[PDB]
Amino acid sequence: QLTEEQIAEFKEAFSLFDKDGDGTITTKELGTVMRSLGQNPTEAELQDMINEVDADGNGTIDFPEFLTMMARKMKDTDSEEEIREAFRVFDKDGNGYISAAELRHVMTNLGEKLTDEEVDEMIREADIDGDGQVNYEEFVQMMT
Amino acid sequence: KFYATFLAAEYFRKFKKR
Ligand SMILES: [Ca+2]
Ligand SMILES: [Ca+2]
Ligand SMILES: [Ca+2]
Ligand SMILES: [Ca+2]
């Protein structure tokens, strides 16, 4: 079950999308973050993404709705789809390898400014075969 | 991609750890 800290991490995530801190995530705000993650969703795509979470159908996602969804996916430790999705967020050029630049880009988006050494260290931490990049197998092990 | 973004932050936290 959700702990005090868990809700804290989920609030951090929610705030990343709720830029104006009005308590709700709009398709406009989701689009802004998706484009910052290397995606380019159409309005129809964004509407579908909001819909899956917008339990009461008012067209936006509030914290309770966000928490419900995030808590549910976290309980599915057997699911790998979320890890595959995260991998794609990192792997912007779709070549199956997360490069140092690709990893830095995501971290920068999260508001974490890392030095080149920190980035190389983050890569190294998951880079089992030492080729300088993180493939999917390496990414999973890192996440699990 | 809501949860994916959370996981990205997870990759970071774990790093900041040990
Ligand atoms: Ca908002
Ligand atoms: Ca709603
Ligand atoms: Ca890549
Ligand atoms: Ca590697």
Short mmCIF file of C-alpha atoms and ligand atoms in Angstrom, two decimals:
data_model
loop_
_atom_site.label_atom_id
_atom_site.label_comp_id
_atom_site.label_asym_id
_atom_site.label_seq_id
_atom_site.Cartn_x
_atom_site.Cartn_y
_atom_site.Cartn_z
CA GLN A 1 0.00 0.00 0.00
CA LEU A 2 1.03 3.62 -0.58
CA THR A 3 3.33 5.16 2.03
CA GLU A 4 3.84 8.81 3.01
CA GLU A 5 7.02 8.95 0.93
CA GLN A 6 5.44 7.21 -2.07
CA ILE A 7 2.80 9.94 -2.24
CA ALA A 8 5.62 12.50 -2.05
CA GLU A 9 7.37 11.08 -5.11
CA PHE A 10 4.05 10.92 -6.96
CA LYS A 11 3.35 14.55 -6.09
CA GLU A 12 6.74 15.44 -7.57
CA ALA A 13 5.74 13.69 -10.78
CA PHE A 14 2.31 15.33 -10.79
CA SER A 15 3.88 18.78 -10.40
CA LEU A 16 6.07 18.19 -13.45
CA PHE A 17 2.90 18.13 -15.53
CA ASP A 18 0.83 20.62 -13.52
CA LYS A 19 3.08 23.56 -14.42
CA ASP A 20 0.63 26.24 -13.25
CA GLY A 21 -0.04 24.31 -10.04
CA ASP A 22 -3.81 24.66 -10.38
CA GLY A 23 -4.35 21.07 -9.26
CA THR A 24 -5.16 19.62 -12.66
CA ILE A 25 -3.26 18.38 -15.68
CA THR A 26 -4.69 19.52 -19.02
CA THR A 27 -4.02 18.14 -22.50
CA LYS A 28 -2.09 21.38 -23.08
CA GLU A 29 0.20 20.73 -20.12
CA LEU A 30 0.65 17.08 -21.06
CA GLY A 31 1.59 18.11 -24.58
CA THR A 32 4.23 20.46 -23.21
CA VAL A 33 5.87 17.69 -21.19
CA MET A 34 5.52 15.05 -23.93
CA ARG A 35 7.28 17.33 -26.39
CA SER A 36 10.01 17.82 -23.81
CA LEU A 37 10.42 14.05 -23.70
CA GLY A 38 11.02 13.67 -27.43
CA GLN A 39 7.42 12.92 -28.40
CA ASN A 40 5.04 14.82 -30.67
CA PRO A 41 1.51 13.64 -29.84
CA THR A 42 -1.48 14.89 -31.80
CA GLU A 43 -4.35 16.42 -29.86
CA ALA A 44 -6.30 13.18 -30.33
CA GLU A 45 -3.40 11.25 -28.78
CA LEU A 46 -3.22 13.62 -25.82
CA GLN A 47 -6.97 13.37 -25.28
CA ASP A 48 -6.70 9.57 -25.18
CA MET A 49 -3.86 9.76 -22.64
CA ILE A 50 -5.86 12.07 -20.38
CA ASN A 51 -8.97 9.89 -20.78
CA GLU A 52 -7.29 6.73 -19.47
CA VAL A 53 -6.61 8.52 -16.18
CA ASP A 54 -9.51 11.00 -16.01
CA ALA A 55 -11.84 8.75 -14.00
CA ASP A 56 -14.72 11.24 -13.68
CA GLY A 57 -14.54 12.37 -17.30
CA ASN A 58 -14.27 16.12 -16.75
CA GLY A 59 -11.47 16.33 -19.30
CA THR A 60 -8.51 16.78 -16.94
CA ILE A 61 -6.52 14.82 -14.36
CA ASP A 62 -6.56 15.86 -10.72
CA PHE A 63 -4.21 14.57 -8.01
CA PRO A 64 -6.55 11.87 -6.69
CA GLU A 65 -6.90 10.48 -10.23
CA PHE A 66 -3.15 10.70 -10.80
CA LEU A 67 -2.42 8.96 -7.49
CA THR A 68 -4.91 6.18 -8.22
CA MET A 69 -3.26 5.40 -11.56
CA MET A 70 0.31 5.68 -10.31
CA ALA A 71 -0.40 3.51 -7.27
CA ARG A 72 -2.00 0.85 -9.46
CA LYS A 73 0.86 0.63 -11.95
CA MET A 74 3.37 0.49 -9.10
CA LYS A 75 1.55 -2.53 -7.67
CA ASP A 76 2.09 -4.36 -10.96
CA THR A 77 5.74 -5.23 -10.33
CA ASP A 78 5.29 -8.07 -12.83
CA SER A 79 4.50 -5.66 -15.67
CA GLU A 80 7.29 -4.63 -18.04
CA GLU A 81 5.27 -2.33 -20.29
CA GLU A 82 6.01 0.69 -18.10
CA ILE A 83 9.74 -0.07 -18.25
CA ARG A 84 9.51 -0.40 -22.04
CA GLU A 85 7.76 2.97 -22.13
CA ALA A 86 10.43 4.57 -19.96
CA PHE A 87 13.13 3.11 -22.20
CA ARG A 88 11.51 4.71 -25.25
CA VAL A 89 11.40 8.07 -23.44
CA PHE A 90 15.17 7.86 -22.97
CA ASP A 91 15.96 6.32 -26.38
CA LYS A 92 14.93 9.28 -28.50
CA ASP A 93 16.56 8.17 -31.74
CA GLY A 94 15.07 4.69 -31.43
CA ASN A 95 18.33 2.85 -32.01
CA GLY A 96 17.88 0.62 -28.97
CA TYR A 97 20.69 2.25 -26.98
CA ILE A 98 20.48 5.04 -24.42
CA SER A 99 23.46 7.31 -25.02
CA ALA A 100 24.96 9.68 -22.47
CA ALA A 101 23.31 12.61 -24.26
CA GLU A 102 19.95 10.86 -24.25
CA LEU A 103 20.16 10.14 -20.55
CA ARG A 104 21.25 13.70 -19.78
CA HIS A 105 18.35 15.08 -21.79
CA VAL A 106 15.76 13.28 -19.69
CA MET A 107 17.44 14.26 -16.43
CA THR A 108 17.62 17.89 -17.56
CA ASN A 109 13.88 17.71 -18.20
CA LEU A 110 13.33 16.42 -14.67
CA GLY A 111 15.14 19.55 -13.51
CA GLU A 112 18.38 17.74 -12.69
CA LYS A 113 21.44 19.49 -14.15
CA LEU A 114 24.27 16.97 -14.29
CA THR A 115 27.94 17.44 -15.10
CA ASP A 116 29.44 15.31 -17.86
CA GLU A 117 31.10 13.17 -15.19
CA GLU A 118 27.83 12.57 -13.35
CA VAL A 119 26.21 11.56 -16.64
CA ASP A 120 29.01 9.15 -17.50
CA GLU A 121 28.72 7.71 -14.00
CA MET A 122 24.97 7.21 -14.41
CA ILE A 123 25.60 5.38 -17.67
CA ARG A 124 28.42 3.32 -16.15
CA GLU A 125 26.10 2.25 -13.31
CA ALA A 126 23.82 0.43 -15.75
CA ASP A 127 26.29 -0.21 -18.59
CA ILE A 128 27.08 -3.86 -17.89
CA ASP A 129 29.01 -4.57 -21.11
CA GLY A 130 30.87 -1.26 -20.95
CA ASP A 131 30.21 -0.04 -24.50
CA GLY A 132 29.24 3.42 -23.28
CA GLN A 133 25.51 3.00 -23.76
CA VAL A 134 22.59 1.36 -21.99
CA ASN A 135 20.59 -1.18 -24.02
CA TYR A 136 17.19 -2.49 -22.98
CA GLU A 137 18.49 -5.53 -21.08
CA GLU A 138 20.80 -3.24 -19.12
CA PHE A 139 17.98 -0.76 -18.52
CA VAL A 140 15.66 -3.41 -17.08
CA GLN A 141 18.25 -4.76 -14.65
CA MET A 142 18.90 -1.19 -13.54
CA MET A 143 15.19 -0.59 -12.96
CA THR A 144 14.48 -3.97 -11.37
CA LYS B 1 3.90 8.65 -20.19
CA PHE B 2 3.07 9.76 -16.65
CA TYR B 3 4.48 6.64 -15.04
CA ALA B 4 7.44 6.53 -17.42
CA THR B 5 8.42 9.99 -16.20
CA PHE B 6 8.17 8.74 -12.62
CA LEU B 7 10.47 5.83 -13.49
CA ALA B 8 12.99 8.20 -15.04
CA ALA B 9 13.09 10.01 -11.71
CA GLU B 10 13.50 6.59 -10.10
CA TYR B 11 16.61 5.90 -12.18
CA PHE B 12 17.98 9.14 -10.70
CA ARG B 13 17.05 8.57 -7.05
CA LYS B 14 18.66 5.12 -7.06
CA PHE B 15 21.76 6.78 -8.50
CA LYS B 16 21.88 9.47 -5.82
CA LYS B 17 21.74 6.58 -3.34
CA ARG B 18 24.66 4.26 -2.55
CA CA C 1 -2.59 22.67 -14.39
CA CA C 2 -10.84 14.39 -13.82
CA CA C 3 19.48 5.97 -28.66
CA CA C 4 26.00 -1.32 -22.71
#
